[PDB]
Each structure stands twice: as structure tokens, then as C-alpha cells.
Design a protein around this ligand. Structure first.
Ligand SMILES: OC[C@H]1O[C@@H](O[C@H]2[C@H](O)[C@@H](O)[C@H](O)O[C@@H]2CO)[C@H](O)[C@@H](O)[C@H]1O
Ligand SMILES: OC[C@H]1O[C@@H](O[C@H]2[C@H](O)[C@@H](O)[C@H](O)O[C@@H]2CO)[C@H](O)[C@@H](O)[C@H]1O
Lengths: 159, 158
């Protein structure tokens, strides 16, 4: 329904792509990640995420993150296929900030009831649907990416 | 408050945040060396002089200093201004400044429902207890993107 790809115009902090996908029962993806980092938020239904010999059964409110070099498989459930929203991002600041959160350890997490993460990801995907750089949507998306990385660090801090 | 930060970023950078209560009849007369410095007048009165114009500024006014400007700004004798300032730099910062009309005269008034005052005050508050181990660096960049967005929204080019 949405897969907006942006230019790699920034090297410190960059929004690479925003997407929304309703899974087809029993179908998904099996590949080595090429993109820098892609955070997925499960909005509905059920799917599986497999990485490094572990198989996670994910549901509404779960996050999984893809990082360059990871061999992953993620597949919608046969009975009740997931919908997910994703933010792909890159840059030297982005990668330093990712090292301040525990989520990059296992690459899976659950959003707490009062999490700020869902609203930010949904808002970035909404902006991306009618992206207009002449209306400074580029500034708004970078503001939201900084808010997202701040929220990940606040909710999933390193020891 | 006068917190100076490293020039650690080149696309978008918070250079400094400050708060100054002016001394009656005193101020500054110099060629600006910093990239860009937005000042917000929180109290009182002062004068800003640039390119042969003399502005009488008051609470709610903004003035912006840009590299190369020869400026004089002086607190009023009767009720000296307090001002808050955000110094910033970077290739993104300078592109975004070209999307606003405020860089034409370098003076403006914040309208009643403006988001600018709350952002500038919040950045100066964060800067007072700046702790990078608690990711205050990310928070200040988030607020700088919010500030430049607000300037474009409230002071658009025609
Ligand atoms: O990037 C999130 C996005 O990934 C898609 O999978 C793509 C991937 O983006 C691409 O770099 C790789 O070369 O091929 C994959 C397709 O096998 C997913 O299709 C999409 O649902 C999102 O998860
Ligand atoms: O940068 C805003 C800040 O400027 C101070 O003035 C300094 C200026 O920053 C510095 O670049 C220059 O070399 O010396 C000036 C003092 O003469 C102001 O003092 C301060 O109130 C702010 O306006």
C-alpha cells in the first residue's frame, strides 16, 4: 500500500524509505539485509521473525529491526496475517544512536502501553504518502527520525 | 547561560544556547563570525542596528545574526531586554534558512499562536543541564529541526 524510497541525500541522518505492507497468509521474505537499518512495527495480526537460529512469534505492538548483513526470514501467519509499518534509515549519527539502545542486541522488542514509538512510525508513514519537499516534508521526516531514535533509547536503554 | 558545543556535525549542528539579561545602555558592536544565531526577546527593550536601519525591539521580537553582518545591539536604559539565543550551523541548516523570509530583514515579531518561543526556551533549558550520556544531544537536534520547520511555517517565502 506504501513503499516510498528517498534519495541518500544525507550522510549523518537520513530517512531512506517508509512503508506499509498487509501480509498475504503464509508468505514473506528470506534474504540477507542490504539496507543500513529498518525498524518494523506490527500494527495488526501475527507473523514470525527468524534470525540467528531463533524464531519469534510477533503480534500487534511488537517491533523487529533489520540491520545490514543479518540473514532474516519474516512470514505472515496463515490464520491472521500481520500488517507492519517500517522506517528505513542510515547515517553516522543514526548508527551511533542505535548503539545506545538494547534493541540492537536481539533485534526484537515489545512497545509498552504508553510507548511514543507507534505514533512516530505511523506519522512518518502518513507524511510519506503525500511527501512534498516544497512544503518542507523533508525537515518534518528528519525531526520525526530524531524523535524515534530518542524514544528507542528512552524505552530500551543500554545498562 | 552561554553553553558552547563542539562543531561535531556538518549537516545540522547546535553551536550554542544562551540567555543574557542586558545592562542598561550596554551591548555589542561587531562583524558576526558565527554561521547563524537566532535571538528571542523575552522581556524589556533594546535596539538592533544593521545596514543603516535601527529597530526598536521588545518582548516577542526575534533578530537573527548571520556570518558577515556588521551589527550593533544595545539594551534600553529604561527597561533592558533579556534575550535567549540558539546558534546553529550545517549545510541542511543553511538550505532551510533560504526557505524563510526572516533572513531578508533579519527581524520579525512572533504572532500570538507562534511555536517559536516554546522551542527556543526548551533548547536553552536542556542546555543548562546538558548531559550527552542521557542523549540530550539527540533532543537538541530534534528541537533545532522543529525550530527551522516553525520558522518556515510562520515566515514562508512567497
Ligand atoms: O526494507 C524493508 C522492506 O524489505 C522488503 O524486502 C526487500 C528488501 O527491502 C530489499 O533490500 C531486498 O533486496 O529484497 C527484499 C525482498 O526480498 C520487504 O518486502 C518489505 O516488506 C519490507 O520489510
Ligand atoms: O552569538 C550570540 C551572542 O553573541 C555575543 O557576542 C559575541 C559574539 O558571539 C562573538 O562571536 C564575538 O566574537 O564577540 C561578541 C561580543 O562582542 C553576545 O555577547 C551575546 O549576548 C549573544 O548575542
Amino acid at each position: 500500500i506504501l513503499w516510498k524510497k528517498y534519495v541518500k541525500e544525507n550522510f549523518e541522518m537520513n530517512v531512506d524509505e517508509c512503508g506499509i505492507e498487509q501480509g498475504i497468509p503464509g508468505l514473506g521474505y528470506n534474504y540477507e539485509v542490504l539496507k543500513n537499518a529498518v525498524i518494523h512495527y506490527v500494527t495488526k495480526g501475527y507473523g514470525t521473525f527468524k534470525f540467528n537460529g531463533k524464531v519469534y512469534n510477533l503480534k500487534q505492538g511488537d517491533i523487529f529491526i533489520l540491520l545490514k548483513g543479518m540473514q532474516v526470514e519474516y512470514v505472515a501467519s496463515i490464520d491472521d496475517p500481520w500488517e507492519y509499518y517500517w522506517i528505513g534509515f542510515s547515517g553516522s549519527n543514526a548508527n551511533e544512536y542505535l548503539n545506545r539502545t538494547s534493541i540492537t542486541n536481539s533485534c526484537v522488542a515489545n512497545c509498552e502501553e504508553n510507548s511514543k514509538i507507534p505514533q512516530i512510525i505511523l506519522n512518518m508513514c502518513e507524511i510519506s504518502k503525500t511527501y512534498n519537499p516544497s512544503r518542507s516534508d523533508d525537515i518534518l521526516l528528519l525531526k520525526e527520525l530524531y524523535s524515534l531514535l530518542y524514544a528507542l533509547i528512552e524505552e530500551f536503554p543500554k545498562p
